[PDB]
Design a protein around this ligand. Structure first.
Ligand SMILES: COc1ccc(S(=O)(=O)N(CC(C)C)C[C@@H](O)[C@H](Cc2ccccc2)NC(=O)O[C@H]2C[C@H]3OC(=O)N(c4ccccc4)[C@H]3C2)cc1
Ligand SMILES: [Cl-]
Ligand SMILES: [Cl-]
Ligand SMILES: [Cl-]
Ligand SMILES: [Cl-]
Ligand code: NA
Ligand code: NA
Lengths: 99, 99
């Protein structure tokens, strides 16, 4: 689809067998999801932006479905205020900015 | 242009006769830029980022050129790590997200 930006670009994702709402976020290098369980190995990481840093768990090789498009990549899990799909997964669904 | 997301979507902006680098950010409701001098009155605003909330200064009706596209709108000024062009000005320049 072509998404205009009058409203937040929210989509439905499937991750870890669960459906969630997430924001397509071109300004995020990384995908960050609210607290949830994922299978497999993780490591701790600190990420920062406006307001400072949070501690997250880094899960690698996680399959996700984003508005019906499958991808795989790293997912950071922790106390983010909103689920964000960052560039690491937006590339995999072929997302571009057009003007 | 069509901008892929393999790299950060950085562009040059011009505000108060000064060139700056900024991110085209579909996850930002509003435009937020690093401390600088702007004309006119400002109003208080609280914005929430990945690590919590910060206070910024809201300046309305500011002239800003974004990747060569003229916009006139709201600019938030405060302690952001990176200059961010948010949806308020992405809509003005006719940007869409496409996949
Ligand atoms: C109301 O208007 C606004 C309210 C909030 C914002 S926001 O907090 O910037 N944010 C609102 C979303 C959080 C929901 C827009 C969002 O795209 C920001 C934009 C941004 C902010 C600060 C530093 C870098 C990039 N991305 C962002 O938080 O990504 C986090 C996930 C990582 O991906 C990065 O690219 N990060 C990074 C951090 C530091 C330096 C370089 C990269 C890490 C942080 C902007 C506008
Ligand atoms: Cl909205
Ligand atoms: Cl990845
Ligand atoms: Cl591509
Ligand atoms: Cl505006
Ligand atoms: Na893994
Ligand atoms: Na003004």
């Amino acid at each position: 689809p072509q998404i205009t930006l009058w409203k937040r670009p929210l989509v439905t994702i499937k991750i870890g067998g669960q459906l969630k709402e997430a924001l397509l976020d071109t300004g995020a290098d990384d995908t960050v999801i609210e607290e949830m369980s994922l299978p497999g190995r993780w490591k701790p990481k600190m990420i920062g932006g406006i307001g400072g840093f949070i501690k997250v768990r880094q899960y690698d090789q996680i399959i996700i479905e984003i508005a019906g498009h499958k991808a795989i990549g790293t997912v950071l899990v922790g106390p983010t205020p909103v689920n964000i799909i960052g560039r690491n997964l937006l590339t995999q669904i072929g997302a571009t900015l057009n003007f």
